[PDB]
Amino acid sequence: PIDADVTVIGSGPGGYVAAIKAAQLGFKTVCIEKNETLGGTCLNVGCIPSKALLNNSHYYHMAHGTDFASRGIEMSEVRLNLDKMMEQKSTAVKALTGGIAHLFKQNKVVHVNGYGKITGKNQVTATKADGGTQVIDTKNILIATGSEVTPFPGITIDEDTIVSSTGALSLKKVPEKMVVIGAGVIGVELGSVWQRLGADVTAVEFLGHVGGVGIDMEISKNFQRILQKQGFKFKLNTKVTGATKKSDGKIDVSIEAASGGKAEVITCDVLLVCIGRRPFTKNLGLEELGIELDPRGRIPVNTRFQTKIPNIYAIGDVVAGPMLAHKAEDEGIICVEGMAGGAVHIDYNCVPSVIYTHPEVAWVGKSEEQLKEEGIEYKVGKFPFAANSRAKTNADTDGMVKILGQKSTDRVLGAHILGPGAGEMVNEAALALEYGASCEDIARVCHAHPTLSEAFREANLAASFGKSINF
Amino acid sequence: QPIDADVTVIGSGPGGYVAAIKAAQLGFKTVCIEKNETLGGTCLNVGCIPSKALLNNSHYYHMAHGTDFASRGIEMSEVRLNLDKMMEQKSTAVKALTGGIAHLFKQNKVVHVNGYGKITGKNQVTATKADGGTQVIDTKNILIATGSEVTPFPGITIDEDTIVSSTGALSLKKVPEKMVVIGAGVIGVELGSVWQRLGADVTAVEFLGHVGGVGIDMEISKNFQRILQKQGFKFKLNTKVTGATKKSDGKIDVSIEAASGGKAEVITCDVLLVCIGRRPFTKNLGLEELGIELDPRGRIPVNTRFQTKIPNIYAIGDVVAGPMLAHKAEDEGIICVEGMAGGAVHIDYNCVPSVIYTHPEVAWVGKSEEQLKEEGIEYKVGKFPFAANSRAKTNADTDGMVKILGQKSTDRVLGAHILGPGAGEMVNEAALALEYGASCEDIARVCHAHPTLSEAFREANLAASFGKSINF
Ligand SMILES: Cc1cc2nc3c(=O)[nH]c(=O)nc-3n(C[C@H](O)[C@H](O)[C@H](O)COP(=O)(O)OP(=O)(O)OC[C@H]3O[C@@H](n4cnc5c(N)ncnc54)[C@H](O)[C@@H]3O)c2cc1C
Ligand SMILES: Cc1cc2nc3c(=O)[nH]c(=O)nc-3n(C[C@H](O)[C@H](O)[C@H](O)COP(=O)(O)OP(=O)(O)OC[C@H]3O[C@@H](n4cnc5c(N)ncnc54)[C@H](O)[C@@H]3O)c2cc1C
Ligand SMILES: NC(=O)C1=CN([C@@H]2O[C@H](COP(=O)(O)OP(=O)(O)OC[C@H]3O[C@@H](n4cnc5c(N)ncnc54)[C@H](O)[C@@H]3O)[C@@H](O)[C@H]2O)C=CC1
Ligand SMILES: NC(=O)C1=CN([C@@H]2O[C@H](COP(=O)(O)OP(=O)(O)OC[C@H]3O[C@@H](n4cnc5c(N)ncnc54)[C@H](O)[C@@H]3O)[C@@H](O)[C@H]2O)C=CC1
């Protein structure tokens, strides 16, 4: 038996960052993790492995395809060694999970390996796999249990032939034909990876656009068109009726128009189900404790991230807001800062979103649909990467930067990027929004030449003054 | 056949062509005069554009030919260099972009005059074509954007064949077996890297004790140098080249010695790259008759509206004081023209970033530790290595760090220095931060997307502000 000031259940982005920050703040900190490694979804079956595969597959594409040759890099033959590519992936995951073990040690956070359950308003009991337990009496409890894949009823995931993103990140062979349910972020990212390695990919989507919630429709549309030219096929506004695994090993996927009718069947070698994720809170002790979940399974919390019980908090994927890793970490940090007395404030309008395909997609702030729905009078500035010096020099010119500015004050209301370097570029945009900067502000900042950031600068100039210089 | 205008821009490089476009968009009847066969000045034709094309292609060659792709399961038979094809990619880009300026001039009503321009009156410019033909332009204002030229090394004459300036270095016909570079400045390091990557044995000889040129932070420079040396790039610091001579052999012997004197010796190479700097170009512009005197470095003195001694005659870009960079010239051109239209004119050279496009890249804006020291500014430091950055680790590109310098009391960011992947792009968020007078805390508190290289920027500010970053 042992005690602490703060007990965080979960070693994911929200959890481990919170543990560390609480420790650095002067709290006696304990972190409970049920899995064999720290890092949660992001490190082990999420962010890290997916980006590694996105990265390696893109490079395979450049070598195997036409890009490298056009640059004077001639190679007789280019073959995929999926075993070694997955190896690179695993190496990154092993190194980063180790890093957290080292960081906990460095900040003297204590690692309790086991399945935690809140056994008392000031206690958490960690029951290992061998039944051997451990008790932790603490002043505050921080729930950072995260999420799990959202199952598709009627279809049972077996991570072999019918998989979730977890199975898809470790496919043993490039599937010949792959069907993806859900043309969201995972769908487009994992679909793209396997499409590049040689699979024939079709994403089936219930809604009428790709990219998930909050993406700007014009950007979503241009993105789809580019992916389609890459080989990626889409069936939008389509519902999946069901799926059956056949004795020959193939999988039949029944579909129909979302508005009924147009029955069809798609046959594939691998089915990837990715229609979202949901908060994971089972056997945590909330029903017992009195913590009622909302209809969607999230733990309700106030502006300081505390539950019904004033000393029990919840952050990350287990609570409302975008289910993203940087969002979970920020909440962890501010939640424990709040525990130490500081103010606690987060503005989800300033949390960016990134899609790590190629081209990448990234945005922060409002989409045009949001502004029209809100009756906002705004201005639009667009700048194609085809007119950007660095993009043209690199011979990688798909897409554009689109800026939405308030008509009255020129304040940047939304930044949307489709193209090279979008993921890094959106952070200059997040910073701008944090200060309430104007389109003109950005346009007058001296950006390095030649860089992709200049497309960003010119789109702001266009939004502000009406015309950019290079287009 | 005289033509008239409100603004006549002499020169079509970054400064000039942007100023011409901006002036036209503001409503001025605008003329842009260029003596070369194409538009775009140094940057587009023999500078920024072709060097970045080669830097990009040579890096990819390295990733393929070397061990990188192999480590990712991308197995290749025999990676080979088709120098002709690679030079073609570089050229296709230069042609496309230069043609783009011509189209933008047309779209914006800018009148392009081909010929060597000379100010022949307070309100007149005459452009003389190759065929001796003449075009006169009566104009309300004159904007000198004549740029620069390579600084010659006395005693060594460049022939763009075996003894080259950056221009010949950008079009070498074959990979040199051995190459020596005079000057470990930005060009020396970038082009030296290009050729090194393509198979050349490269050594840069530098008179000073560090690589990277003026302004680079010393800690950053030494870390950069060490990383380059691990790549095979050789350096002879605090060493001066006393001369070069070409043998019947075809090779060239370079006599060098300690910068202070003595230690004399000779080294030999196939190609000699002379890049000891660039200088303002104002030749035969008519400045002497106008009474417009140059400063000691050959630059045109201008006031805060970029006006020369004669108020309706202006100068911007490489011909005037400040960093000789393309973005600097472009900004000076825009604000200069905005001023001509009565608006405020403001530029703070402390917020003009600098980038070195090697791999890893180097980027900075604001002050270096040495500048803050000589200025007496009390400051604190925040560092974060790319080895602890998630995007950097997953991509196996972990060299470097971000270093933030904040004012000890106010926590205001005073300087940002980045060594590693994505530096060139990342420095722009830093520049936005400096413009706003951000504090290290302001930065650490903005939500940066995970996983991005930019998180290193965030963490380093967190370290400078709070004392510790989260992931290191
Ligand atoms: C394939 C994929 C790719 C992704 N890519 C990105 C990306 O590029 N960028 C981004 O921002 N987001 C990405 N995400 C989403 C991101 O991973 C999640 O938003 C993030 O991990 C949420 O963090 P968290 O700390 O709240 O929860 P999680 O990381 O889901 O979980 C934290 C930990 O809680 C543990 N836990 C749960 N209950 C208990 C208990 N009772 N006792 C002990 N331990 C417990 C879990 O085992 C887990 O390790 C991706 C997700 C997937 C699936
Ligand atoms: C190899 C190399 C790489 C570089 N890389 C970068 C980089 O990555 N980033 C960066 O910011 N900077 C870089 N630079 C520097 C950058 O190119 C210059 O700072 C920039 O071109 C300056 O712009 P400018 O408009 O003042 O002058 P310039 O572009 O030098 O010249 C403008 C024009 O003036 C014309 N002209 C001159 N006199 C007359 C006359 N009398 N009549 C008519 N026309 C005339 C010239 O022919 C030229 O076309 C690089 C330079 C070199 C040499
Ligand atoms: N790069 C990044 O930032 C990444 C973030 N993530 C995040 O992880 C979480 C889960 O990702 P996803 O599973 O992709 O969720 P998502 O919401 O991004 O995409 C799910 C897709 O499935 C569609 N859908 C839902 N039900 C359906 C049905 N019955 N039939 C057909 N289509 C249906 C949704 O409209 C959506 O297009 C999200 O928060 C996502 O943003 C995941 C990968 C990468
Ligand atoms: N990536 C970018 O932004 C790039 C910018 N440029 C710019 O173009 C201009 C010129 O660049 P560079 O030619 O590299 O000049 P530089 O100033 O960057 O470097 C010239 C070097 O020559 C050294 N030197 C001088 N005399 C010497 C001698 N006799 N022996 C040995 N060394 C000697 C100087 O110490 C200096 O280090 C600069 O403004 C530079 O910033 C050039 C290339 C790239």
Q: Domains in chain B, start-ordered, CATH in brackets? A: 1-150+277-348 (3.50.50.60), 151-276 (3.50.50.60), 349-472 (3.30.390.30)
Please state the φ and ψ torsions of residue A73, each to the nearest 5 degrees. -105, 95
Q: Token pair of B93, please?
A: 């880009």
Question: Residue A362 forms beta bridges with which residues?
Answer: A354, A417
State the distance from the centre of ligand 4 to the C-alpha of B274, rounded, in angstroms. Answer: 10
DSSP-based three-state secondary structure for B110: coil
Question: Residue A127 forms beta bridges with which residues?
Answer: A115
Closest chain A residue to the Cα of B21, Cα to Cα: A469
The CA distance from B336 to B330, in Å, is: 10
DSSP states of B357-418: -SSSEEEEEE--HHHHHHHT--EEEEEEEGGG-HHHHHTT----EEEEEEETTT-BEEEEEE
Q: Could you tell me the CA-to-CA distances from A245 to A173, A178, A215, A254, B375 in Å, in that order? A: 18, 13, 34, 12, 73
The CA distance from A445 to A198, in Å, is: 43
The CB-side HSE value for B6 (13 A sphere, CA atoms) comes to 16
Give catalytic status of residue B210 as yes or no: no
Ligand 1 pocket, residue A145 CB under 6 Å: yes
The CA distance from A216 to A220, in Å, is: 6
| Placement of tokens 């068109």 in the chain | A225
Cis peptide before A450 (omega within 30 of 0): yes
The CA distance from B262 to B425, in Å, is: 43
The CB-side HSE value for B74 (13 A sphere, CA atoms) comes to 25
Closest chain A residue to the Cα of B467, Cα to Cα: A24
Closest chain A residue to the Cα of B23, Cα to Cα: A469
Torsion of CA B410, B416, B417, B422, to 10 degrees: 140
State the distance from the centre of ligand 3 to the C-alpha of A204, rounded, in angstroms. Answer: 12
Burial grade of B291 (CB within 10 A; 0-12, 13-18, 19 or more): exposed
DSSP-based three-state secondary structure for B273: strand
The CA distance from B159 to B172, in Å, is: 12
Q: Helix/strand/coil (H, E, C) string of B17-74?
A: HHHHHHHHHCCCCEEEEECCCCCCHHHHHHCHHHHHHHHHHHHHHHHHHCCHHHHCCE
Region for residue B380 given its phi and psi (left: phi exceeds 0; alpha: psi -120 to 50; beta: otherwise): beta
Determine whether the interchain pair B73/A95 forms a contact, defined as Cβ–Cβ distance below 8 Å. Answer: no
For residue A284, which atom of ligand 1 is closest to its CA? Answer: 41
The CA distance from A290 to A302, in Å, is: 16
Torsion of CA B117, B119, B120, B126, to 10 degrees: 20
The CA distance from A394 to A187, in Å, is: 28
Q: Find the helix or strand (DSSP H, E) in which B449 lies.
A: none
Q: Helix/strand/coil (H, E, C) string of chain A?
A: CEEEEEEEECCCHHHHHHHHHHHHHCCCEEEEECCCCCCHHHHHHCHHHHHHHHHHHHHHHHHHCCHHHHCCEEECCEEECHHHHHHHHHHHHHHHHHHHHHHHHHCCCEEEECEEEECCCCEEEEECCCCCCCEEEEEEEEECCCEEECCCCCCCCCCCCEECHHHHCCCCCCCCEEEEECCCHHHHHHHHHHHHCCCEEEEECCCCCCCCCCCCHHHHHHHHHHHHHHCCEEECCEEEEEEEECCCCCEEEEEEECCCCCCEEEEECEEEECCCEEECCCCCCHHHHCCCCCCCCCCCCCCCCECCCCCEEECHHHCCCCCCHHHHHHHHHHHHHHHCCCCCCCCHHHCCEEECCCCEEEEEECCHHHHHHHCCCEEEEEEEHHHCHHHHHCCCCCCEEEEEEECCCCEEEEEEEEECCHHHHHHHHHHHHHHCCEHHHHHHCCCCCCCCHHHHHHHHHHHHHCCCCCC
- Residue of B425, B458, B472 to mutate, interface with A, max A Cβ within 10 Å: B425
Residues in chain A with CB shorter than 8 Å from the CB of B444 are: none
Determine whether the interchain pair A421/B424 forms a contact, defined as Cβ–Cβ distance below 8 Å. Answer: no
Question: Residue A110 forms beta bridges with which residues?
Answer: A30
Q: Are A324 and A398 in contact (CB under 8 A)?
A: no
Q: Could you tell me the CA-to-CA distances from A253 to A159, A242, B66, B286, B331 in Å, in that order? A: 17, 6, 44, 78, 57
Ligand 1 pocket, residue A14 CB under 6 Å: yes
Residue A56 CB partners (closer than 8 Å, separation 6+): A85, A88, A89, B72, B73, B74
The CA distance from B246 to B221, in Å, is: 33
The CA distance from B323 to A212, in Å, is: 45
Q: Smallest Cβ distance to A55: which of B21, B394, B424?
A: B394
The CB-side HSE value for A152 (13 A sphere, CA atoms) comes to 23
Cis peptide before B451 (omega within 30 of 0): yes
The CA distance from B350 to B327, in Å, is: 13
Q: Are A88 and B396 in contact (CB under 8 A)?
A: yes
The CA distance from A173 to A197, in Å, is: 10
Q: Token pair of B436, please?
A: 């706003």
Q: Could you tell me the CA-to-CA distances from A89 to A50, A165, B72 in Å, in that order? A: 8, 14, 9
DSSP-based three-state secondary structure for B309: coil
Residue A401 CB partners (closer than 8 Å, separation 6+): A382, A383, A385, A415, A416, A417, A419, A425, A455, A456, A458, A459
Q: Are A128 and A33 in contact (CB under 8 A)?
A: no
Ligand 2 pocket, residue B318 CB under 6 Å: yes
The CA distance from B330 to B215, in Å, is: 21
For residue A144, which atom of ligand 1 is closest to its CA? Answer: 26
The CB-side HSE value for A119 (13 A sphere, CA atoms) comes to 12
- Biggest alpha carbon distance in chain A? 68
CB atoms near residue A267 (< 10 Å): 12
Determine whether the interchain pair A13/B450 forms a contact, defined as Cβ–Cβ distance below 8 Å. Answer: yes
Q: Are B32 and B64 in contact (CB under 8 A)?
A: no
| Placement of tokens 């106010």 in the chain | B410
H-helix segments, B233-299: 287-290
Q: Token pair of A172, please?
A: 């043993």
Residues in chain B with CB shorter than 8 Å from the CB of A80 are: 73-75
Strand-strand pairing, A2-9 and B239-246: unpaired
Q: Smallest Cβ distance to B391: which of A51, A60, A69?
A: A51
**Helices and strands in chain B: count of H runs, count of E runs:** 15, 24
Q: Smallest Cβ distance to B447: which of A84, A430, A447?
A: A430
Residues in chain A with CB shorter than 8 Å from the CB of B422 are: 424
DSSP-based three-state secondary structure for B240: strand
State the distance from the centre of ligand 1 to the C-alpha of A317, rounded, in angstroms. Answer: 7
Determine whether the interchain pair B448/A427 forms a contact, defined as Cβ–Cβ distance below 8 Å. Answer: yes
